[PDB]
Symmetry: D4
Subunit: 217 residues, 8 copies
């Protein structure tokens, strides 16, 4: 009976609701706009036109029965703050709120939001990382110094090997997976071959990976 409410159907909120309902979960789409409700109705377990700033409508949805509530309102700062304050004063266990600027994050922190999300800023940082380094496809920072990076193998790495491309001693990183033509190899053996336009999953220090990219690739 785990329940998720998504207040504020937008790109972020609509994506959250659609992805949660695709997973086989109970989601209630809530938006003050009738058209947004009609849009995301077929992608949720329930869809109600409600003004989340209103305590009466909030109670009428059965908001108390939801373990998780996600306020994806990000453009209207005062509406998002009102919804978050109402949800806290109604004792919702987990409130995840989308922020707009740093002060919105501060005021959502002070009123007790469980998690505050900055989607656009994070994706902008990631896309900038992919912009300066045209090799990287995706990545994940384990810490401020260590990261796992997926990379497009260049012509310089075409038909090379795991011992021919030695990184555990020449650059300090290790190689974790290789994707060729759609088939993936995990924990690759020292004999495995990397080809041009393959996907390489390296892991180590940021500067180590960049050393490998400048010198190796």
């Amino acid at each position: 009976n785990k329940q998720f409410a998504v207040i504020g159907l937008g790109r972020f909120g609509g994506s959250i609701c659609k992805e949660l309902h695709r997973m086989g979960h109970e989601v209630l789409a809530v938006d003050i706009n009738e058209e947004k409700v009609n849009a995301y109705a077929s992608y949720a377990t329930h869809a109600v036109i409600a003004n989340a700033t209103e305590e009466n409508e909030l109670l009428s949805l059965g908001i108390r029965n939801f373990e998780y509530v996600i306020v994806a309102i990000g453009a209207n700062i005062q509406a998002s703050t009102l919804t978050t304050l109402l949800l806290k004063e109604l004792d919702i266990p987990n409130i995840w709120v989308k922020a707009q600027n740093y002060y919105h994050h501060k005021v959502l922190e002070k009123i007790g939001a469980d998690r505050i999300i900055h989607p656009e800023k994070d994706m902008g940082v990631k896309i900038a990382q992919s912009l300066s380094d045209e090799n990287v496809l995706n990545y994940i920072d384990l810490s401020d110094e260590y990261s796992i990076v997926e990379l497009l193998a260049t012509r310089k790495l075409d038909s090379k090997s795991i011992i021919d491309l030695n990184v555990r001693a020449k650059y300090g990183c290790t190689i974790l997976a290789i994707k060729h033509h759609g088939d993936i190899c995990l924990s690759p053996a020292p004999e495995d071959i990397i080809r041009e336009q393959d996907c390489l999953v390296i892991m180590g220090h940021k500067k180590d990976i960049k050393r490998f990219e400048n010198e190796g690739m």
Copy 2:
């Protein structure tokens, strides 16, 4: 270094500009809102007020001299499409546009945009995956079936060494890194232990990682 031009300062494009200049690149912050230009003036090389949909203002910016142009406008579909068409007529090597819906992405496809980004949608998918599983902190999908996952250790995981939790054979997964008290052990040994409320990096097929989440932690 590299010639970047971020048209459309916003939460996404502004983050791109800020991070790319912290990276030390020539980033031209283009906006029509004077307050937007002033907000990111301290973070860019040149911050010019201009309407990108105007050909005269675009030639005034010298936008043909830039190798990378990023149209982060995603709310004004017409303005974004017009700017992308103007840049494609100007033979820009790389055009990266932010899209709003499927049809905006389609019209950006037809007019020759090089890379179309949907930040809010993908980040909402990620946050929904974190909502359905409170254990996962971050992840990267190698393919539609294989992934690397960051997890938060639980009471069922405290003082459990890597040899007690055989993931190499019980689930076909591999533990990649442990993070304890801000320090990090990369490629940990079978005798290394894990304490609760730590960051655990595992690699393998999605259902196998979920199997470990269910049975082990």
Copy 3:
């Protein structure tokens, strides 16, 4: 069962719909404005209030059954582009779209519009031709050099003949029809007479016709 849909009731679109329904054809008038629908209802086979940007309403009209669809929306550029993209992605054979500027024409070209029309620009060119040359009433350009021109015969041509006004040798043109008091003569004999304020249909090079106008008329 040939079917024409006219989306965007306006001067151009309303004229297209009224002229097609006068011809004894099946036309569906579609406009987002209830008043425009009520206006052009009595001049069409069917009239429905629909938002053409909406895929659901577009499917509800039975848009798939129309062989020809005419998007006469010209002022709202983004709405016209959305309607055209939807009609293409719904596999409409012939899409005829009214344009507003040269970039609207380009974006309608890139998304696959079958025909793009610039009514106002064309009629402005024609009216300018009638403005500088007060003699011409209507015309048609066969090529960039040859044209057929209807002209008001001046007093200088009153009670003149086809051999008295020789143009097949004196100016290189030929005379094709003469309209006197409402009666018309085609392929006129060499003995036919032109009178003042008659309609003369000459045909030949533009400069040849202008020679005849300066010298003959």
Copy 4:
């Protein structure tokens, strides 16, 4: 040369101004929108920002010195009517106004406009005639019953000479010109042949031309 004044730069009036100056005439581009004046400044002799409905601004323009004044305003009915009345009070020899509906045309009639144009309506009639008959490319109506038509040749017409297709006696029409590969044969001979996807100019009564379209091609 000739004194023209295009009040109301738009798709229609702007085309008039552009073409008339490519023709090399003194064309005064009058508009109230500064951006409209700047858009057509490179194509006119003088492009002044002015409100035509104001008598003081109209005397400032020296509009009484112009033989031809064209009020292309068709969306603001009141402004167009007021401008036409102001010009008629100023004894302008030729006033040509763009109209929107039947009643705007009637009030332009009553206040003494010399020529009223309905561009979109007539062009929509033409495009509707081209929609009902895909063969016709352009046409000019000599009278309500007689016309000259440009047609696109079909497979039924390839390698057919002018004597095989007797239009002079079988249908009472006459072929006027053939256009093949951008070259053009004017007043073609009976032994001249026509290939498919060519431009064919025929002349005659409307029903007779349609008879040839049905039976021949």
Copy 5:
């Protein structure tokens, strides 16, 4: 069966309708505003919410049955012109239209309005006449030189007579009525007495009356 229609309920139009219905006449109040119709309903024989610019609604009121129609719309110039043109083209015998400026009067003249009224301008002239001459209460100009004037008798005229105040020879005017305490005397005898604050009805040349006011009063 004499019938009056009042289109445009306002101060002027509402006053016309209320005064006509007080007289025991058939009046139809017509206004596009539901509140104005509800207001002037109880003061008319009928009240209908109608958009007079619409020919269909105009016909639905039975506008053809009205001998007199008064378009009191004065602020919306284009709406008043449209209503007047419609009423003329529907062959209304008498059309009385309220004007706003001199050009509105001209355009209503050209489209065939039977009477054009300038209420505010006329009353402003009258109030200015009462302003400069504090003696005058009301008046009526018989011609540009002769007028009948009602005046407040001053202390200088208190307890004076018709032969004591001789005006048929001393100033060229005659005295026509005297109102004392509410009782009025017409064609007053030479023995009648004027008292302070009485109402005097003099008649003659403007300069003659002003002579009498400067010298006599």
Copy 6:
């Protein structure tokens, strides 16, 4: 001469200002609309742009120096009331305000306005009286029962002398003046005749004048 200040240039107040300056008085044209100030600048002594509801701007105008202040604002009830209150606080001898409805007149009464004018209402009463009786041209009501009336002569009145139409005894009225072909006979003799389409001035009780209109003409 006299110190007048017309606050609120409009159709009423603008007429007051224009006529009063044609009369040669010091008329201060006060308005908040710059175009309104410019429109009546050529007709006044001083035309200042000012907001009358502001005490500082009112003391800047030197409005305490004026003996007569006319607030012609009748659409903005609040602004007119505030201006009247500001002038009454400034001890203006004569304040004449234009009113919109009964309640605006009441609040102008309570705050001490000297004279309240309802131009449109009274002029609509006059025009309604002219509509019910096409014979009357103008009139002045001496009392609720007695009046002077200007009439248009009919066929029943042509070549009728003043002794044939005994109004002195048959109806208790008196003919005051005749107007023929722009010339005027004042206080006409019993042998003076009247032709049709002339201006006839009669004086007497309302019902008696109507009796003559019915029986004589």
Copy 7:
């Protein structure tokens, strides 16, 4: 059957209505906004959506039966003036109106409002008094010179007495009540003790109390 009407639900008006209905009185909440009526419905004896500027709706509420009527409209000056004038002309005994500025107070005075209230100005004065004097909690001015003041006893007054803190002779004031930990003592005996952070109710001249605060506290 004493009855209170509250027109203008706002902070001030809503507080008046809620406090009057808490007291066990008959209150009718009246607001032109449906949401305000729904809000203050559960806190009143009746709640009706009405436009108080309308005489018909005002009569429909039964406004004649209310002995007290409170116009809490303060932002819309003209609406408040209209409501007050209507209530006076309907002979309401007691009209209490909320004012906005000094001129609104003047115009409400002139139209006969029984009481005019300036809540925000009064509370601003009180809060300024508490701002400069951080000791005072609340007070009440008996006259422009004498006042009763509640004060927070400082550390300088901790464990002091009524004869140890002598004010009837040392500063001219008297002590009236002492509040310790929630228990209050009225007309305190000469032996009573004041403690730190207690509430002291002194009474006397303003300068006397300030002497005591500077010297004693």
Copy 8:
């Protein structure tokens, strides 16, 4: 003296500023409306136009140098909250904010506002208490049960001495002061008399004061 900064000039904050400067303090009048800054410029030391929600403008004002900051904005909830958060981040010792509703007060609580004021609510409570009891003029509540009350004397109270009205024993209350004809007797004697229409200060429990109001007056 003391450093005050009133952000948000309004009826409340403007009164605070005016009174505090009449008190002779350094009061910085901060507003975004230029007319608001000009309105209170004559009553403050410095009156700067600034947007308080902007960090740059706030550091430009030198707001960190002020010991007391009063955000009187109560209609714009977002702007007030943002300003309060900006000041709390700047370590202002005393922040006093004006609130609109319970939730605005709650968010001001969470972000660390020192004192939150609800002027209209409390003043409406006071005016409601004065409406239910016409005798009370002002009052101060010592506790939820004890209060000091100012009353207006009635006919039942004229010529009644303090010993005839034993409030010390009949009701447990005490008369504190009498006010007659603008003069005031403080701490009056048992033989002092009271006349009607005087100001009487009584002290005691609420129900006891009401008992005296019922039985005595």
